[PDB]
């Protein structure tokens, strides 16, 4: 049906996600998204990871069909750059690197946090080992 060969590959997914766009920048550690606020930039679509087995990279598009399509590669080894609502707001945010020099700065959200746990929660799922393989 699936199984037939185990790999190093998290296989993450999620046909309903929304994301936002903001502008690679920093200039410290710590977010603030109670200061930062942001209601424009965050189309809505399909989000998922994965890595072929020395490397990982990260597609995007939509579970429907689309149009655009594009994706993050990811060198498997600069894993880094996610934090959430640093004052208590209603959403989080992930990046991640790649080289050790290129890193991508978006936000992940959902109209809810019920379900916008159970996609955060799946991912890790997948990468560390702790409820299962």
């Given at each position: 049906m699936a199984a037939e060969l185990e790999y190093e590959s998290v296989l993450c997914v999620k046909p309903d996600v929304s994301v936002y766009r903001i502008p690679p920048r920093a200039s410290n550690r710590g977010y603030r998204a109670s200061d930062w606020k942001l209601d424009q930039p965050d189309w809505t679509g399909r989000l998922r990871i994965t890595s072929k087995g020395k490397i990982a990279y990260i597609k995007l598009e939509?579970?429907?069909?689309?149009?655009?399509?594009?994706?993050?590669?990811?060198?498997?080894?600069?894993?880094?750059?996610?934090?959430?609502?640093?004052?208590?707001?209603?959403?989080?945010?992930?990046?991640?690197?790649?080289?050790?020099?290129?890193?991508?700065?978006?936000g992940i959200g959902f109209t809810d946090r019920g379900d916008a746990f159970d996609f955060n929660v799946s991912l890790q799922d997948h990468f560390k080992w702790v409820k299962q393989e």
């Open positions: 939509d579970k429907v069909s689309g149009e655009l399509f594009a994706q993050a590669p990811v060198e498997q080894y600069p894993g880094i750059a996610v934090e959430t609502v640093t004052d208590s707001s209603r959403y989080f945010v992930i990046r991640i690197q790649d080289g050790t020099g290129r890193s991508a700065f978006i």
